[PDB]
Every structure is written in C-alpha cells, then in structure tokens.
C-alpha cells in the first residue's frame, strides 16, 4: 500500500497469536514493543529517544507479521509509550519514503 | 525521490541562513529542531518520546526548505538529540510510506 501521513501510520501486527497496534517509524533504528512476555533468551540493552534512554530486553530472530508480510528480526521489549516498527523491519517489507 | 531505509533517512534542510541535517521521521507528529534563536513569539510546550518528555518552544508559520520543497509551518525548538522532520511537514512535501 501507499500510506499517507495525515495521521499516525498505525498498523496491526501479529506476533505469535497476539495482535498489537504499532507505529511505522522511519525515525527508529529498531523495533520496540511495550512490556510483554516472549520466549527464548534475551539481553538487556539501552535505547535512546527524545527524552533520554530506556532499558529494554533484546530478543533476536522473532517472527512477526506486518501488513501481510512475514518477517523475522530483533524485537526490543520495554517501556516505549507506543509500539514501534523500526527500520530493521521496514527494510524487510520493502518500505520507502516517497515524495 | 524514493528513500530507502537501510540508513537513517537524513536530509539537509535550510532554515533562513542555516543549513542543518534532519531526520525524515514518520514516528514524529511534529518537527523539532535543536536549540536555536528563531524570530517571533513562541509558546512553551511539552513533547513525549521513547525516554520521557522534553520541553520545547513552539514557533508557528516558519519557512523551511526541505529537498527542494518550500514548506511553511510549526517548528518546535529544544533539546532534541537530532533534528526531526515530523508529519506536519512531511505532509507538506507530499511524503508517503510505500511498500
């Protein structure tokens, strides 16, 4: 699709049986989801934004479905105010910014 | 143009006599520039992001040139880690996300 930017570009994603609303975010290097449980090993990471840093858990090789696209990558979990799909996954769905 | 997302989507903008690097950011409602001394009135404002909130100054109807497009709108100024072009100005240049 072509997604206009009049409103926040929110989409529903699926992660192992769970639906989540997430923001397609060209200003994010990484994908970050609000606190939730995920299987497998993880390691702590600090990520920064407007307003400073937060501690997140880093989970690698997680499969997610985003707008009908089945992708696999790193998912960070922690206190982001909104779920974020970052460039690590936007590149996998073939997303570009067009004007 | 069609901007891929393998690297951060940074562009040069021109605001008055100043040239700056800025991030084309679909995850930002508003445009926020690093501290600078713009003409005219301003209202203080709080904005939130990944690490919490920061305080900024809101200036309205400021002209900026972005990728050869002249836009005129609201610019926030404050301690942002990177200059950000948000959806308020992305829409004025006719930006969409495509995949």
């Amino acid at each position: 699709p072509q997604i206009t930017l009049w409103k926040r570009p929110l989409v529903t994603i699926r992660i192992g049986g769970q639906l989540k609303e997430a923001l397609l975010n060209t200003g994010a290097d990484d994908t970050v989801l609000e606190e939730m449980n995920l299987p497998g090993k993880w390691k702590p990471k600090m990520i920064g934004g407007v307003g400073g840093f937060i501690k997140v858990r880093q989970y690698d090789q997680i499969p997610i479905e985003i707008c009908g696209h089945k992708v696999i990558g790193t998912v960070l979990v922690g206190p982001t105010p909104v779920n974020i799909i970052g460039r690590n996954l936007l590149t996998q769905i073939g997303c570009t910014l067009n004007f | 143009p069609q901007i891929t997302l393998w690297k951060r989507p940074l562009v040069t903008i021109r605001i008055g006599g100043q040239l700056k690097e800025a991030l084309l950011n679909t995850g930002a409602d508003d445009t926020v520039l690093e501290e600078m001394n713009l003409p005219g009135k301003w209202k203080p404002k709080m904005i939130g992001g990944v690490g919490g909130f920061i305080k900024v100054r809101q200036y309205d109807q400021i002209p900026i040139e972005i990728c050869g497009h002249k836009v005129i709108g609201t610019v926030l100024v404050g301690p942002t880690p990177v200059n950000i072009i948000g959806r308020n100005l992305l829409t004025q240049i006719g930006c969409t996300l495509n995949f």
């Binding site: 923001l23 200003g27 290097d29 934004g49 | 950011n25 995850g27 990944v50 990177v82």
Partner: peptide
C-alpha cells in the same frame, strides 16, 4: 539513540 518517536 535510537528511536525518535515523538508526540504532543
């Protein structure tokens, strides 16, 4: 940084 989500 990271992750430049921003809102008002």
């Amino acid at each position: 940084p990271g992750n430049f989500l921003q809102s008002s």
